[PDB]
Design a protein around this ligand. Structure first.
Ligand code: CHL
Ligand code: CLA
Ligand code: CLA
Ligand code: CLA
Ligand code: CLA
Ligand code: CLA
Ligand SMILES: CC1=C[C@H](O)CC(C)(C)[C@H]1/C=C/C(C)=C/C=C/C(C)=C/C=C/C=C(C)/C=C/C=C(C)/C=C/C1=C(C)C[C@H](O)CC1(C)C
Ligand SMILES: CC1=C[C@H](O)CC(C)(C)[C@H]1/C=C/C(C)=C/C=C/C(C)=C/C=C/C=C(C)/C=C/C=C(C)/C=C/C1=C(C)C[C@H](O)CC1(C)C
Ligand SMILES: CC1=C[C@H](O)CC(C)(C)[C@H]1/C=C/C(C)=C/C=C/C(C)=C/C=C/C=C(C)/C=C/C=C(C)/C=C/C1=C(C)C[C@H](O)CC1(C)C
Ligand SMILES: CC1=C(/C=C/C(C)=C/C=C/C(C)=C/C=C/C=C(C)/C=C/C=C(C)/C=C/C2=C(C)CCCC2(C)C)C(C)(C)CCC1
Ligand SMILES: CCCCCCCCCCCCO[C@@H]1O[C@H](CO)[C@@H](O[C@H]2O[C@H](CO)[C@@H](O)[C@H](O)[C@H]2O)[C@H](O)[C@H]1O
Ligand SMILES: CCCCCCCC/C=C/CCCCCCCC(=O)OC[C@@H](O)COP(=O)(O)O
Ligand SMILES: CC(=O)/C=C/C=C(C)/C=C/[C@H]1[C@H](C)CCCC1(C)C
Lengths: 217, 165, 73, 194, 39, 74, 194
């Protein structure tokens, strides 16, 4: 049994056969937020959405930032890309956010309805024939049809491992974005610049030297 | 600006009040020596006064005709004119700590309620269980919302005692 | 003279269909017309509210001549 | 049932299947009581009919060039005379109130005395398009759907006028000229923080 | 020692220790952050 | 504005909507609303003197309101 | 079936063999249900017919020297008059939308009221090219294949225009004049690293 703390008392709610079926089960729940099975299922969906969203965002911040350091691209910093992208644009940020909220609300409402009732999106005569493809697999949060065009989820032997590479990576991405924010309020530069400045002198450039992360020192 | 008030960084009464406080402190300081404990204490108080006035003017507070700051309690005005730090953020901070303490106490009561003698657990606090619940109460809003959605937060009408009407 | 209303009918015809108020105002005409303490309580509540209204309106909106200059009054 | 307003959600039990426009949309459970649901049906049909006529009139006046629906009663407030289709009308505001009040009182009085009738027929159907009750089902749905759409359209007319100051056609032309740059998120009234 | 810990676990002793800790935390917070009126 | 024309028209119009439009509704509400005097009349629809006085009062009030509003010149 | 899209891979078990243009290409399994497959079949045939007409019209108008397909409604952006084959047309954009909308709505309503008929025939087949059902299936394969090619061609038209700016005929001549220097890799937006 893999654990996040060797010797710590693993919670009973995380030891059930249903809880162990989730990917990345390391028995980490010191606050007991997953005692309720309904709450655990909802939080599992939230963790999956956060993992995918954080992975896409951190990728869109790290890859163009790494290409900017080289001569591949000239993408500005993530904390300044919004202003630069809205300057020479075709619409203000308010109109764009309104269209975004509408388009995101529709799909999130459909996802919410499928979470409330699995496979309910396949109601006949409701999506111009595309309702059949809107029914996900047996596991919540893992749909097929239009999603997953390559069909890599049909092989079960790697499926259980595939999900492990999706949650864990996502968790890392979730911390990555957090660092991106903290570093922004601690050094004032970008993440790639902070990485290079740290690699230049690791013994004197860290969180214990900026004076912000350790005010008592 | 809002309600006919002016910012503390541009109020004459605010500066006059600061000069009055510094004047009375300096007047009290002139009666002592230079390398004595009361003089150092008075200088420290004066530095604290200067830092307090500078910080209040730096925060963008709105002062009145008396030179004293004013708080904005309307959420719209606070979030629209940069006054959310006065009454909005501390409101949510107190809500978090209040629900935190309430949830910890409720969890302790429900936990000791099923034991043999709950009154002993009430007069003599079970420090290990109380400490565990105190550390676990960080997720109080999530646990409270999940409890409310499940219907286990409230007790039924038939299980509560009432008057004979 | 035939025309007009009956307070009992208006009271008995004011119950929401959702059952939020229970039986609504059914039987309120008999419990008020036959109880002098209920009528006295309603009258005193309205009178006290009107008295406070009088105090506020008279100091803010002076109705009598040369009344604002008289501070003691 | 014509359809499902929330794909994958169970329809309310108090809503009949043969009701026109029955999409199962009632989160507040307002039609749970059978008597209340009966009044709400005729109320919705009457509202849809009035809104359809109102939206058609507001569109026709601006499409022909006689101002918007908001500028229509502006003649009675500052020395003006009503013009219908470019023809002068010899009636003051006081005379219009008496005639409209008497006519509407008579019409609505007969309708109310009828007993909540939603589909009168007969004298109201001179062309006989709903003689058979078997084919009236596919035509009643069209009426309720067009009525709901016109209700939303009139509400939008009032909202866009109160938030911009221009008529319905004027807001359409401006939006067709600049869709991304001129919408509800750019008027400064709808969303204040945008 | 079990009886001593049980005595220290009573309501007045626990209340005294808890209020002393809370008061000390608030006092030290106001000491290192003088005159906090806003956030 | 002529006062005679306005008052006569308002009174006649409300008496007409009281006798030919809202008579049945008022009679049905008065019946369900449940020493006295019965006012027998020869009107076929039972429009007694009490209803005439009430409708005429409403008509005169509305007519005088119209006359006053038009007198204000607004 | 007309063949296999991916050699070595087995065709899906829900695709009928008698369907025209059946290549077993369905990795997303969108036509899993027979009800959705019928609608998608009619939609694909209609899309192919419209794509064929659109591609033929764009190529014809560009080869006849009447501008590219992108500069077709440009006369109604700045104010002008449309010219079909060099002959002036007196209809403006406001009147063109009305007639086109009315005619298209009537025709599409009549077509959709039949219940999704893909191959009507009769009045639409006066020459009788499909009198015998033995050879009717062979021409259907050609029809769906030409439609698929036309849809891909129209997608290519839009993509190459948004990537370069020139029209389909102007892009063909440019590519024939400089194949290594004028292609999808030299436009500048397909590959940002190059
Ligand atoms: C008449 C009221 C009515 C209301 C309130 C809704 C509401 C909703 N429908 Mg809808 N519907 C309604 C009628 C109907 N729907 C449908 C057919 C559908 C389908 C097919 C779907 C919905 C879905 C949705 C949801 C989309 C959320 C969204 O896009 O948010 C974002 C908000 C916007 C895009 C616009 C907001 C404008 C304004 C209100 C914002 C200002 C505040 C949502 C809760 C979707 C869903 O969630 O399914 C589970 C979906 O797939 N509806 C039909 C025809 C059968 C209707 C007929 O009357
Ligand atoms: C606890 C009671 C309470 C009271 C007495 C008020 C009172 C007020 N609020 Mg409010 N508000 C409250 C709770 C309260 N609020 C809460 C809990 C929230 C969080 C949702 C808000 C969020 C809020 C916002 C975002 C705004 C106000 C605003 C206002 C002021 C005018 C609007 C109004 O009266 O309509 C009641 C307020 C609401 C129903 C909230 C929606 C805002 C309405 C639609 C007004 C917006 C229109 C426009 C901006 C008005 C400004 C006109 C002019 C000065 C430019 C007014 C003094 C407005 C303001 O003055 O901006 C500085 C403003 O925009 N409030
Ligand atoms: C588990 C602790 C607890 C909880 C969850 C509540 C909760 C509640 N109380 Mg209550 N109360 C408590 C303890 C608690 N009380 C105690 C010890 C007293 C005696 C002083 C009171 C006296 C009291 C009165 C007179 C009233 C309430 C009321 C209420 C309700 C309104 C909210 C409020 O903040 O009121 C105010 C809360 C207080 C005045 C006391 C708070 C005391 C602390 C902060 C609570 C925790 C103390 C405890 C020692 C910690 C647990 C230790 C454990 C972890 C080892 C609410 C449901 C009101 C009501 O009737 O309901 C609408 C009301 O009128 N309470
Ligand atoms: C019949 C529905 C309808 C239509 C066709 C329009 C059309 C239009 N409106 Mg309008 N509006 C509507 C309803 C509608 N509105 C309603 C109900 C309200 C009150 C909330 C408003 C309030 C409003 C304001 C304040 C403004 C407009 C404006 C405009 C114009 C610019 C677009 C825009 O930003 O609007 C936005 C409309 C909404 C956010 C609400 C639309 C309601 C639904 C979502 C649309 C109809 C449903 C649609 C047929 C199918 C939806 C499916 C989809 C969600 C997937 C445009 C021509 C702006 C203008 O004047 O132009 C410069 C303007 O400022 N509208
Ligand atoms: C309900 C009444 C009330 C309220 C709302 C306040 C509010 C406040 N008082 Mg006050 N006070 C009160 C009653 C009250 N007091 C009474 C009755 C007395 C007499 C005993 C005093 C005597 C008093 C003094 C002597 C002082 C204050 C001060 C303060 C300010 C300090 C903020 C702070 O502690 O930093 C922030 C607190 C924290 C960061 C702790 C956070 C808790 C945890 C660690 C984090 C959780 C957050 C999520 C604050 C705005 C101080 C001040 O400077 O005034 C401006 C100060 O010197 N008060
Ligand atoms: C019927 C199939 C078809 C045919 C015969 C052509 C033919 C042609 N295309 Mg094209 N294309 C197609 C489909 C097709 N395309 C589709 C489906 C797309 C969308 C991905 C594109 C997107 C596209 C772009 C972006 C460009 C061309 C261009 C061209 C021309 C140069 C070859 C080239 O680099 O493109 C490569 C063809 C494929 C990668 C397929 C050439 C005459 C280039 C051009 O316009 O020349 C100046 C160019 O910029 N095409
Ligand atoms: C488990 C648990 C339980 C127990 O009981 C207790 C405890 C301990 C408490 C716990 C823990 C928790 C945690 C840690 C959490 C966290 C989370 C996160 C971090 C998230 C994020 C998350 C995150 C996310 C999503 C993110 C996303 C992002 C994005 C979109 C981005 C975007 C962008 C880009 C691209 C670029 C531009 O230029 C900018 C922007 C616009 C900005
Ligand atoms: C269903 C439900 C149930 C659940 O449970 C809950 C909820 C959600 C709440 C719901 C919903 C609701 C809603 C939405 C409502 C709305 C309505 C409307 C809009 C109406 C209108 C309606 C509307 C209407 C009638 C309108 C009408 C109009 C008119 C007549 C007009 C007139 C006119 C004209 C001609 C023009 C001129 O120049 C002026 C005038 C004179 C002015
Ligand atoms: C099958 C499947 C299944 C699996 O599983 C999955 C997936 C992959 C999803 C799939 C695939 C899909 C696809 C490929 C799609 C595509 C489509 C298209 C492209 C269409 C178009 C389509 C297209 C179209 C209609 C087009 C049309 C056009 C037109 C009419 C044109 C017109 C015109 C002309 C003459 C020229 C002038 O100057 C202008 C105009 C006036 C403008
Ligand atoms: C027999 C007969 C008949 C009838 C006739 C007649 C002619 C009747 C009538 C009647 C009338 C002709 C009535 C009227 C009336 C009136 C009244 C009843 C009134 C009143 C009053 C009041 C109450 C007022 C008040 C006031 C004042 C004092 C001041 C200012 C304000 C007001 C205006 C409010 C006929 C031929 C149809 C048919 C046959 C048989
Ligand atoms: C902005 C201008 C437009 C706004 C105008 C609003 C004016 C509304 C006037 C309402 C007048 C009430 O008028 C009266 O209504 C009642 C109540 O339904 C109708 O009453 C009818 O339906 C009710 C049930 O609802 C039955 O009990 C009754 O027997 C029947 O007559 C009467 O036939 C009508 O005479
Ligand atoms: C019921 C469920 C509700 C779910 C709601 C989900 C909300 C979706 C979240 C969206 C993220 C919000 C990000 C957009 C806001 C940040 C944009 C912004 O802050 O820009 C404004 C400002 O810089 C522009 O300033 P100028 O360029 O100086 O005008
Ligand atoms: C934009 C708008 O308002 C709606 C248009 C919808 C249509 C034409 C749908 C029509 C049919 C469909 C495919 C289902 C069966 C009946 C119809 C008329 C053939």
């Amino acid at each position: 049994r893999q654990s996040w703390l060797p010797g710590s008392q693993i919670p009973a709610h995380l030891d059930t056969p249903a809880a162990q079926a989730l990917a990345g089960n390391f028995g980490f729940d010191p606050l007991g937020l997953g005692k309720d099975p309904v709450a655990l299922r909802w939080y599992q969906q939230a963790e999956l959405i956060h993992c995918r969203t954080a992975m896409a965002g951190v990728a869109g911040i790290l890859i163009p930032g790494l290409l900017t350091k080289a001569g591949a691209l000239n993408v500005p910093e993530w904390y300044d890309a919004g202003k630069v992208a809205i300057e020479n644009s075709f619409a203000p940020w308010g109109s764009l956010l309104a269209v975004q909220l509408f388009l995101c609300g529709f799909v999130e409402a459909k996802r919410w309805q499928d979470i409330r009732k699995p496979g309910s999106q396949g109601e006949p005569g409701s999506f111009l024939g595309f309702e059949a493809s809107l029914k996900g697999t047996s596991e919540l949060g893992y749909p097929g049809g239009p999603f997953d065009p390559l069909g890599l989820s049909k092989e079960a032997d790697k499926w259980a491992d595939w999900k492990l590479k999706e949650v864990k990576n996502g968790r890392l991405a979730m911390l990555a974005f957090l660092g991106f924010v903290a570093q922004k309020y601690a050094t004032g530069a970008g993440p790639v610049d902070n990485l290079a400045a740290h690699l230049k002198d690791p013994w004197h450039v860290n969180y214990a030297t900026n004076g912000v992360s350790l005010p008592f020192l | 600006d809002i309600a006919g008030l002016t910012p503390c960084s541009e109020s004459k009464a605010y500066a006059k009040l600061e000069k009055k406080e510094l004047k009375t402190l300096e007047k009290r300081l002139k009666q002592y020596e230079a390398d004595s404990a009361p003089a150092v204490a008075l200088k420290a108080t004066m530095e604290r006064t200067k830092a307090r006035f500078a910080n209040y003017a730096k925060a963008g507070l709105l002062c009145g005709n008396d030179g004293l700051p004013h708080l904005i309690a309307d959420p719209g005005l606070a979030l629209k004119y940069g006054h959310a730090g006065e009454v909005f953020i501390p409101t949510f901070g107190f809500l978090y700590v209040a629900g935190y303490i309430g949830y910890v106490g409720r969890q302790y009561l429900i936990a000791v309620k099923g034991e043999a003698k709950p009154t002993d657990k009430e007069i003599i606090i079970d420090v290990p269980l109380a400490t565990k619940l105190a550390w676990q109460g960080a997720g109080w809003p999530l646990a409270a919302v999940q409890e409310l959605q499940r219907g286990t937060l409230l007790e039924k009408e038939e299980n509560i005692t009432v008057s004979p009407r | 003279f035939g025309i007009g209303h009956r307070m009992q009918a208006i009271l008995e015809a004011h119950t929401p269909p959702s059952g939020s108020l229970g039986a609504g105002h059914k039987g309120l005409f008999d419990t008020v017309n036959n109880s002098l303490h209920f009528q006295l309580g309603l009258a005193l509540a309205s009178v006290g509210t009107i008295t406070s209204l009088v105090a506020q309106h008279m100091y803010s909106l002076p109705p009598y001549a040369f009344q604002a200059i008289d501070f003691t009054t | 049932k014509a359809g499902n307003w929330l794909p994958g959600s169970d329809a309310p039990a108090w809503l009949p299947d043969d009701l026109p426009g029955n999409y199962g949309f009632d989160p507040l459970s307002l039609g749970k009581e059978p008597a209340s649901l009966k009044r709400f049906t005729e109320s919705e049909v009457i509202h849809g009919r009035w809104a359809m006529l109102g939206v058609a009139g507001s569109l026709a006046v601006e499409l022909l060039g006689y101002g918007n629906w908001y500028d229509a009663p502006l003649w009675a407030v500052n020395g003006g005379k009503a013009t219908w289709f470019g023809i002068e009308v010899p009636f003051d505001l006081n005379a219009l109130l008496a005639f409209e009040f008497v006519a509407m009182a008579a019409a609505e009085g007969q309708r109310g005395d009828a007993g909540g009738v939603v589909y009168p027929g007969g004298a109201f159907d001179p062309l006989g398009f709903a003689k058979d009750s078997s084919k009236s089902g596919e035509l009643k749905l069209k009426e309720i759907k067009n009525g709901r759409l016109a209700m939303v359209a009139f509400l939008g007319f009032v909202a866009q006028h109160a938030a911009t100051g221009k008529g319905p056609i004027a807001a359409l032309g401006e939006h067709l000229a600049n869709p991304w740059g001129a919408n509800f998120a750019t008027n400064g009234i709808s969303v204040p923080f945008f | 020692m079990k009886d001593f810990t049980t005595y220290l676990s009573t309501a007045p002793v626990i209340a005294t220790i808890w209020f002393t800790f809370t008061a000390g935390l608030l006092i030290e917070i106001n000491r290192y952050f003088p005159d906090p009126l806003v956030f | 504005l002529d006062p005679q024309i306005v008052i006569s028209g308002s009174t006649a119009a409300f008496l007409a909507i009281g006798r030919f439009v809202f008579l049945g509704y008022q009679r049905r509400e008065a019946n369900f609303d449940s020493n006295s005097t019965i006012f027998a009349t020869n009107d076929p629809a039972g429009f007694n003197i009490i209803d005439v006085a009430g409708w005429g009062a409403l008509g005169h009030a509305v007519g005088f309101a119209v006359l006053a509003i038009n007198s204000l010149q607004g």
